[PDB]
Amino acid sequence: LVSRLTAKRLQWALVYLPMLVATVYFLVFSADRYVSESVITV
Amino acid sequence: VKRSPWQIQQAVLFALFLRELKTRLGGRWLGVFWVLLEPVAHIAVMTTLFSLAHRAAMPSIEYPVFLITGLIPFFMFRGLVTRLMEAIDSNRGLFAYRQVKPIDTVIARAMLEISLQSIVYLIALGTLGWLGFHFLPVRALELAGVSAVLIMLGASLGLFFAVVTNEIPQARAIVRISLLPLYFVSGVIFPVHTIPPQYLPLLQLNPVLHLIELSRASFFPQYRVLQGINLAYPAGFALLSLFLALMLYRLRRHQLASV
Amino acid sequence: RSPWQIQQAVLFALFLRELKTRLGGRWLGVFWVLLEPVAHIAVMTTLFSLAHRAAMPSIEYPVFLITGLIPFFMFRGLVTRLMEAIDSNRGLFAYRQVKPIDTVIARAMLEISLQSIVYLIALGTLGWLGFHFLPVRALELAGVSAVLIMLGASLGLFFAVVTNEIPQARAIVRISLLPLYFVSGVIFPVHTIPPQYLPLLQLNPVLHLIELSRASFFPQYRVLQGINLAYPAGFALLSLFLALMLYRLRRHQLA
Amino acid sequence: RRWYNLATLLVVCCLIYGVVSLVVATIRDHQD
Amino acid sequence: RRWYNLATLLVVCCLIYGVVSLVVATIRDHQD
Amino acid sequence: RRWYNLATLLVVCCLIYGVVSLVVATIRDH
Amino acid sequence: MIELRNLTKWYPTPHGRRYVFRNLNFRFPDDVSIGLIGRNGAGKSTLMRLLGGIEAPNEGEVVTDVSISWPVGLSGGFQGSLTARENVKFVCRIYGTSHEDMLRKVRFVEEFAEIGEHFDLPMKTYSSGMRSRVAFGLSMAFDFDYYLIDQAMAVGDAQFRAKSRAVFDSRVGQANMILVSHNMNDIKEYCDVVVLVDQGQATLYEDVEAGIAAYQG
Amino acid sequence: MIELRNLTKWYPTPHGRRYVFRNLNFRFPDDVSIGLIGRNGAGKSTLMRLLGGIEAPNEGEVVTDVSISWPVGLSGGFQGSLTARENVKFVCRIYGTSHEDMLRKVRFVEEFAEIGEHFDLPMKTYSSGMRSRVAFGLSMAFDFDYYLIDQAMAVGDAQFRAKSRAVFDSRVGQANMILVSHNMNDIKEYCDVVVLVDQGQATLYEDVEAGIAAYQG
Ligand SMILES: Nc1ncnc2c1ncn2[C@@H]1O[C@H](COP(=O)(O)OP(=O)(O)OP(=O)(O)O)[C@@H](O)[C@H]1O
Ligand SMILES: Nc1ncnc2c1ncn2[C@@H]1O[C@H](COP(=O)(O)OP(=O)(O)OP(=O)(O)O)[C@@H](O)[C@H]1O
Ligand SMILES: [Mg+2]
Ligand SMILES: [Mg+2]
């Protein structure tokens, strides 16, 4: 409950786990997208 | 039995809410009508002196709806700042019962006034709908998110000002009048599409302008948004301000209970 | 002793007490009030300098702004400081010789002296930079300034008396000082205002007083139609009479 | 943009955790 | 303008004398 | 312009030190 | 000598105007110290406010030809955020005292109020006892004939009470004493007669004990 | 059971920090009513504030395994622009009480203070001694074990003293008193032990007379 969220649970559920999953996705899974640019007018 | 601190906090918050309810909208309910007819008093003169100007600036958007979509959020922000500031000094004598912490006064003030402003927003939307104007937002979820971000930003700024200025009584006026220029630089009165471009970047430093533009963009269809206006900047501003205000209250927590 | 001597001594003591709080413990306020007008002028040199030159090229912003800023600042200071009186000396009303009118009078002398010093310093430093600083018609400028002084002191006394029952209505009055700075023509010349908007603004006596002061200061400064001294003079006289009579009415409620 | 996104997310997570911790500490202190 | 300038100088001198008298009184009272 | 960048670096370092000192005092007083 | 002339006092309330005094005629005896006693919420502070010129009666007057001190009490008469020294200086300047006499009065107040560094601090950061000491010294530093002590001595130590008794005995030949208090020993040891106010009327007891018994019962 | 463990309390003066209380390891007695005698400029009021949990010690801890009432004091403790009725509702709402006992507490507070229509008037209209009756009634309405009394009953009539004594006797055998006042007969009739503060140090006398004599000289 309210008087159960120790510093270990707060750090793990708000800092550690999201960073771990996001960095795993970014470094391992995410595919890179090249961008080609042009500048025109009529 | 032990009365766990959440119960004590909620009881103190309810008691403070009931206490400042009398002081906010008058002792005889003479202030509720004032805050009811204040927005219509604003829009009457605003359209009276700017109807043709807004018609030439942009069609397809009625001026009363454009003014309503920017007034009440700004009323929320301004009143949040003011009441959050005055809450700590309003109940100096009440800090004598071991449970009325200074943060509880500002929390109760915010929880009362956001409810009051939501009520008057609902009444204003109903009135606009009764006159045949457009009143239903196209994307209400994003509008609610922007409104929540603005509300929490205003509460954060009010708490920071309350914890800082408390030692300097004459500083309140310095930020009591500073809200009035924000009423003319946030784009609430007039659309920002007519502003000169060279003043655009410096004017974009105001997060309230970004929040107002984002809220308006979620209310009407095909509403264009200025380049460089985003939600990430107000979100970061508000989050950093809330963190800093909470830390500053934590540092000077005992000083505020000097009575 | 004679009542006049008692009043003079009370006013002197109140002035001595008020100077320390108005200025500061280390007199840091002189580092602010002297910096008070400059901070306003500089930004307007970066905003409408070219716009003003297009509007009127005969005069210059560094002098046009000063000729209307410090008088307005002094009127605003009179109104604000006289409105905050009585309460700030509420504990001092315990000696039978300190009356509520004496506090506002002493604050009036303090504000007038401070703003006159600021005016003298500003004119000196404007003449130091080579700008036009000597007034053309000094006597007319002094008369218009005295009329503005009387109007400001009257409004301050009236608001101090009338806000005793309702303190909150005091605060909005301070807020109400902000729009006047934008509508009195201090920042920008009022000749650029569209004609259908001027008659509503003619009801503001501060605009008339500022226009007349600028006319008396600069050589060949034109005055718009409907601008006169009789209307501000009558407004100031009527307001002063009403404020004094209302203070006479509530003479004992404040104490 | 991997590393900039990771750094921004790290700052945001740290700020959120600090805010939550301060809020719960403020709540907890109410005793008799 | 002889009389005009004389009147202007009169007003300026009276104002300056009043302000300097106030300053002198404050200094003398503060200096003990 | 090395001497111009020196002042900016000094300002940045001073601000970082102030923020770090404030947060470490916050942690210490916890 | 101080005489009342059918004076009535009232305050603005939503339910009406409560009459603290209604057509009061009284004559304070001369050459004696007057004990002004009464039940809670019954005069004794509006009376001393009118005696000291704090406020004027709505319909009536107080006639005197004797200098009366300001009503020193448990609160008021001083400005917060102001050093006690400069408060005494302001009070001395109000009466138009010379610089040397003003310095002498400041020194007398400082030596009477046995306060150290706190004498050079704002009056808001004062305990009740030291504020009472400063107020009593300031009141005793002026040459009056009647002193209006509004139970400001209830928060004083034995040292303060002894010093007050000594400083009053130093000038007991000419000055007098109008004191309101709910403690009884000080009233017996200072006052010579008793003035009891009950509802809107004052009554004089030439015997102290008779008035004390009437007020107690 | 109330104990003190290395308290240190100071204030942010312009001239350094004025340490009102240095390191204190005092242990209070048990099952007795304590009289805090002290003197002017001592830390009696600060001690009663700390004991009531009003402000935290700067560098100490006040361990208390018992319920201690808030300091009644002589100034403050009440909300401005409010009647005593709504103040009592606020106080009983802080403690989380049911409506029936809330109304019973309001009735008890109203009947303890011999106040008429003024009970439904703002605290400014109250006399300086009527708010003391209101505060004493509110403090005695609730159930505690150590009532902190700070010179509150110094501005009450003999009827007020009789009422306070009668109600405390009605609460005898279940609660205790910590009373600080400069009226020595009150301490003699109300307290069983004496705690004297001196230069920031608290010393205990098991006899009233010894501590009182140390107080006089
Ligand atoms: N708010 C404050 N800020 C700073 N210093 C204070 C403050 N209040 C009190 N003090 C200082 O601490 C001291 C503590 O005095 P306190 O108010 O406890 O009264 P006391 O000496 O115990 O009793 P009495 O009412 O008999 O004078 C004061 O004398 C003053 O020097
Ligand atoms: N400002 C005021 N507004 C309204 N009523 C007031 C005001 N001041 C005093 N009263 C009322 O006037 C009456 C006279 O009481 P007063 O204020 O003179 O105190 P008192 O009798 O000296 O008090 P105590 O003996 O308890 O110290 C009381 O009923 C009081 O409530
Ligand atoms: Mg009284
Ligand atoms: Mg005390």
Residue numbers in the entry:
A (entry chain G): 5 to 46
B (entry chain C): 12 to 270
C (entry chain D): 14 to 268
D (entry chain G), E (entry chain J): 340 to 371
F (entry chain H): 340 to 369
G (entry chain B), H (entry chain A): 1 to 217
Please share text taken word for word from the publication where this structure appeared:
CPS secretion is mediated by an ABC transporter containing KpsT and KpsM as its nucleotide-binding domain (NBD) and transmembrane domain, respectively.
We determined cryo-EM structures of the KpsMT–KpsE complex in two nucleotide-free states (Apo 1 and Apo 2), bound to ADP–AlF4− mimicking an ATP post-hydrolysis state, and in an ATP-complexed conformation after introducing the E151Q Walker B mutation into the active site of KpsT. The most complete KpsE assembly described hereafter was obtained with an ATP-bound KpsMT transporter. The interface helix and the N-terminal segment of TM1 shift by about 5 Å towards TM5 of the opposing KpsM subunit, thereby narrowing the canyon. The KpsMT–KpsE complex is a dimer of two KpsMT subunits, each interacting with four KpsE subunits.
